[PDB]
Design a protein around this motif. Structure first.
Motif, PDB file in Angstrom:
ATOM      1  N   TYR A 196       0.838  -1.196   0.000  1.00 42.84           N
ATOM      2  CA  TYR A 196       0.000   0.000   0.000  1.00 42.84           C
ATOM      3  C   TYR A 196       0.880   1.256   0.000  1.00 42.84           C
ATOM      4  N   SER A 198       2.229   3.154   2.072  1.00 43.60           N
ATOM      5  CA  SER A 198       1.677   4.195   2.906  1.00 43.60           C
ATOM      6  C   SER A 198       2.278   4.015   4.301  1.00 43.60           C
ATOM      7  N   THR A 200       1.245   5.452   7.036  1.00 44.28           N
ATOM      8  CA  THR A 200       0.281   5.455   8.123  1.00 44.28           C
ATOM      9  C   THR A 200      -0.883   4.502   7.740  1.00 44.28           C
ATOM     10  N   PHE A 201      -0.598   3.447   6.962  1.00 44.09           N
ATOM     11  CA  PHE A 201      -1.622   2.476   6.519  1.00 44.09           C
ATOM     12  C   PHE A 201      -2.483   2.005   7.696  1.00 44.09           C
ATOM     13  N   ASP A 203      -2.966   3.100  10.917  1.00 46.39           N
ATOM     14  CA  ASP A 203      -3.731   4.194  11.511  1.00 46.39           C
ATOM     15  C   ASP A 203      -4.831   4.671  10.562  1.00 46.39           C
ATOM     16  N   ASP A 204      -4.548   4.756   9.252  1.00 45.71           N
ATOM     17  CA  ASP A 204      -5.569   5.216   8.313  1.00 45.71           C
ATOM     18  C   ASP A 204      -6.791   4.288   8.319  1.00 45.71           C
ATOM     19  N   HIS A 207      -8.902   4.641  11.375  1.00 45.08           N
ATOM     20  CA  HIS A 207      -9.690   5.859  11.313  1.00 45.08           C
ATOM     21  C   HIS A 207     -10.959   5.636  10.513  1.00 45.08           C
ATOM     22  N   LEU A 208     -10.807   4.964   9.345  1.00 42.98           N
ATOM     23  CA  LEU A 208     -11.889   4.502   8.477  1.00 42.98           C
ATOM     24  C   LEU A 208     -12.860   3.671   9.298  1.00 42.98           C
ATOM     25  N   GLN A 547      -2.161   6.153  -5.188  1.00 41.23           N
ATOM     26  CA  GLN A 547      -2.705   7.429  -4.755  1.00 41.23           C
ATOM     27  C   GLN A 547      -2.977   8.317  -5.974  1.00 41.23           C
ATOM     28  N   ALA A 558      -6.761   9.620  -1.556  1.00 39.10           N
ATOM     29  CA  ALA A 558      -6.821   8.750  -0.362  1.00 39.10           C
ATOM     30  C   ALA A 558      -8.114   7.940  -0.341  1.00 39.10           C
ATOM     31  N   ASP A 560     -11.495   7.079   1.304  1.00 36.98           N
ATOM     32  CA  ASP A 560     -12.405   7.987   1.985  1.00 36.98           C
ATOM     33  C   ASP A 560     -13.759   7.291   2.153  1.00 36.98           C
TER      34      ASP A 560
END
Ligand SMILES: *[C@@H]1O[C@H](CO[C@@H]2O[C@@H](C)[C@@H](O)[C@@H](O)[C@@H]2O)[C@@H](O[C@@H]2O[C@H](CO)[C@@H](O)[C@H](O)[C@H]2NC(C)=O)[C@H](O)[C@H]1NC(C)=O
Ligand SMILES: C[C@H](N[C@H](C(=O)O)[C@@H]1CCCN1C(=O)c1ccc(N)cc1)C(=O)N1CCC[C@H]1C(=O)O
Ligand SMILES: *[C@@H]1O[C@H](CO)[C@@H](O[C@@H]2O[C@H](CO)[C@@H](O)[C@H](O)[C@H]2NC(C)=O)[C@H](O)[C@H]1NC(C)=O
Ligand SMILES: *[C@@H]1O[C@H](CO)[C@@H](O)[C@H](O)[C@H]1NC(C)=O
Ligand SMILES: [Cl-]
Ligand SMILES: [Mg+2]
Ligand SMILES: [Zn+2]
Length: 609
Positions: A196, A198, A200-201, A203-204, A207-208, A547, A558, A560
């Motif tokens: 990925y 990323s 902050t994969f 943590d992202d 958050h999702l 991205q 990102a 979302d």
């Protein structure tokens, strides 16, 4: 390694890397083809001998990958990352990752054998008194509304598949980590996450999940209530987790199969068109041709003759053992592409047909990329393609166009029915798509040792999905092992990413298509402009950062949740209102609760069998 397949010499600069990459390509396709063909021969025909052949094909693959990997390192280790050709850097970056080809021969043979026996355990397991997973146990979990029948299928399957996988799974985990550690990764999970690109994969994703969790909790509470009215207070605890066998599905991972028990407004049109498909005599063939025809309506490619000649579209009646779990296959020769599915004539199977054909379509679109770049922009994009079209296909208006839903309605009740049905499919899956790799990331990292595989599995199952095992389990059980992707070593977080991303896709395609009503009533069928926007994605393969591909497609770079939240908003509000009016507890604060056995279980199974 055959002389023709071995790497020659190349200058140790970018101009040589290009020729090295070109040389790699011609031999790689041959080696991938031999390995995919051997996997095909085994999975459409499980024998000891096809497993031996597949193991030998895999060993060749490792040999090839070690030779070209070590040459790439020899020539280009200090410099590939400074190449100005971005696609070249991606190619070298791939070739130089050895994976299992890092292991010595004897461990490579151990690894290949473990993959083969774990696969065979899962695909040939059965429950006696003998049922197969597909179709038999699948049909029962889907269609039976008898507590004891469901229980016998659930327990039998988990015991039959999971228990024998456990010692192999342990040995596989250690060997996989050993291999990838030589690529520089702390464990195999870190390698899988690296796709990925990323930092902050994790943590992202958390958050999702935080934004989505309330929709899942309200959907869970409402279904729990319906189950309670049907099964009663002894087997359903309105403040506890739901028994894991009552949700329509072996893994409780999507709940569409119990729609008929929770449908808010029954005298609206019946949105499960399975009965109509049967009545009209649909078979596998018709299902794949109707999916195909959606794709050509968009001016994407039709399935080629080789797909039709070679695919396995139904379970073979000669009763040869096959892996029934649906899958899409790229032979890497730019000609052979096939689906292997034990197709059943059902509405969710029509979606799975679209799902698998979305993979095929990506393969068709990127076939001319260099072999290393024939992948989705990330794994979650490959998983989203077919599901996006299936979102249009499932709409009532679309189903009306293909003869599958005679009555048409456009009212607030019909909308709620449709969104609820969609929520059973999409929302219910969220926690499961998120949790599976949490479990496996902990196993690869050593946080979950074998002495806690089951405990930590059910910790996460209850934590996220709010379910509980309907019979007692201990560490002799290996319930994670009873899910395909675990013995098959297929990553799962892709499906969580896909379930968010497909709504972002849908939103953008629907806008491109010129559509202007409610997001969940959009059908992109026959939109040639939606088609062109989707084709740009598929054609990119992994040649470019995901991205940026995403940003060109939908206008943001990102993942979302807003498109999903917007599609579901009417039912999200309605579910919250209904649960408030019923006085429901959201969540499962009686976290320790598990149902009792049915009296006379399993003795009386022959009465309901
Ligand atoms: C189904 O109906 C919705 C709602 O329609 C609008 O409001 C109704 C109460 C009624 O008065 C209709 O005549 C109205 O058009 C439709 O969504 C609307 O579509 C138009 C144009 O496509 C758009 O400008 C409005 O914003 C939409 N309203 C919302 C809430 O989005 C919808 O297109 C109809 N769907 C189908 C499948 O026919
Ligand atoms: C039925 C669907 N089956 C998978 C799939 O299509 O993903 C199959 C087996 C695992 C991977 N797969 C493939 O075919 C594939 C081949 C190459 C790829 N680059 C990617 C995938 C599935 O498991 N699914 C569908 C969504 C939920 C999930 C599941 O059933 O658990
Ligand atoms: C499934 O695989 C087996 C191999 O395990 C195939 O067996 C071969 O069958 C052909 C035709 O009968 C013979 O020429 C070979 O000698 C067989 N080999 C062995 C080792 O038995 C079998 O044909 C396959 N079935 C299908 C339908 O493909
Ligand atoms: C686990 O469960 C089974 C029966 O459900 C039992 O035979 C076994 O002894 C239990 N305990 C252990 C430590 O395996
Ligand atoms: Cl993944
Ligand atoms: Mg289903
Ligand atoms: Zn898939």
């Amino acid at each position: 390694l055959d002389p023709g397949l071995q790497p020659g010499q190349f200058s140790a600069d970018e101009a040589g890397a290009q020729l090295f990459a070109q040389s790699y390509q011609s031999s790689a396709e041959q080696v991938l083809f031999q390995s995919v063909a051997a996997s095909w021969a085994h999975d459409t025909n499980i024998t000891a001998e096809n497993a031996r052949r597949q193991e030998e094909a895999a060993l060749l693959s490792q040999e090839f990958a070690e030779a070209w990997g070590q040459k790439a390192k020899e020539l280009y280790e200090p410099i590939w990352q400074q190449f100005t050709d971005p696609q070249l850097r991606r190619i070298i970056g791939a070739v130089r990752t050895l994976g299992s080809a890092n292991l010595p021969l004897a461990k490579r043979q151990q690894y290949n054998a473990l993959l083969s026996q774990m696969s065979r355990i899962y695909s040939t397991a059965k429950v006696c008194l003998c049922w197969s997973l597909d179709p038999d146990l699948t049909n029962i979990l889907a269609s039976s509304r008898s507590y004891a029948m469901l229980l016998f299928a659930w327990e039998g399957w988990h015991n039959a598949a999971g228990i024998p996988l456990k010692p192999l799974y342990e040995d596989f985990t250690a060997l996989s980590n050993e291999a990838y550690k030589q690529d520089g990764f702390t464990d195999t999970g870190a390698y899988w996450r690296s796709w990925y690109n990323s930092p902050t994969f994790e943590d992202d994703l958390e958050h999702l999940y935080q934004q989505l969790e309330p929709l899942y909790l309200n959907l869970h509470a409402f279904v729990r209530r319906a189950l309670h009215r049907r099964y009663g207070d002894r087997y359903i605890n309105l403040r506890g987790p739901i028994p894991a066998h009552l949700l329509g599905d072996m893994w409780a991972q999507s709940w569409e199969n119990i729609y008929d028990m929770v449908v808010p407004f029954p005298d609206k049109p019946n949105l499960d068109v399975t009965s109509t498909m049967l009545q009209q005599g649909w078979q596998a063939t018709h299902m794949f041709r109707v999916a195909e025809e959606f794709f050509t309506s968009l001016e994407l490619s039709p399935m080629p003759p080789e797909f039709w000649e070679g695919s396995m579209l139904e379970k073979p009646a000669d009763g040869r053992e096959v892996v029934c779990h649906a899958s899409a296959w790229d032979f890497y020769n730019r000609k052979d592409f096939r689906i292997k599915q034990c197709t059943r004539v059902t509405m969710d199977q029509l979606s799975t047909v679209h799902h698998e054909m979305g993979h095929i379509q990506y393969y068709l679109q990127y076939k001319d990329l260099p072999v290393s770049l024939r992948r989705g922009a990330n794994p979650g994009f490959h998983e989203a393609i077919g599901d996006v079209l299936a979102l249009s296909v499932s709409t009532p208006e679309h189903l009306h166009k293909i003869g599958l839903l005679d009555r048409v309605t456009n009212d607030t009740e019909s909308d709620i029915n449709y969104l609820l049905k969609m929520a059973l499919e999409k929302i219910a899956f969220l926690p499961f798509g998120y949790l599976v790799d949490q479990w496996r990331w902990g196993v690869f990292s050593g946080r979950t040792p074998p002495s806690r595989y089951n405990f930590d599995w059910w910790y996460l199952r209850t934590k996220y999905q709010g379910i509980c095992p309907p019979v007692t389990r201990n560490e002799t059980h290996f319930d994670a092992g009873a899910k395909f992707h675990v013995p098959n070593v297929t990553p799962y977080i892709r499906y969580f990413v896909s379930f968010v991303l497909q709504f972002q896709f849908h939103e953008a395609l629907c806008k491109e298509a010129g559509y202007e009503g409610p997001l969940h009533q959009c059908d992109i069928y026959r939109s040639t402009k939606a088609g062109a926007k989707l084709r740009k994605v598929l054609r990119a393969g992994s040649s470019r950062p995901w991205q940026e591909v995403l940003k060109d497609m939908v206008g943001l770079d990102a993942l979302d949740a807003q498109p999903l939240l917007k599609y579901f908003q009417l039912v999200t509000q309605w579910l919250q209102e209904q649960n408030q009016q019923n006085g429901e507890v959201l969540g499962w604060p009686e976290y320790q609760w598990h149902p009792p056995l049915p009296d006379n279980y399993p003795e009386g199974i022959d009465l309901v069998t």
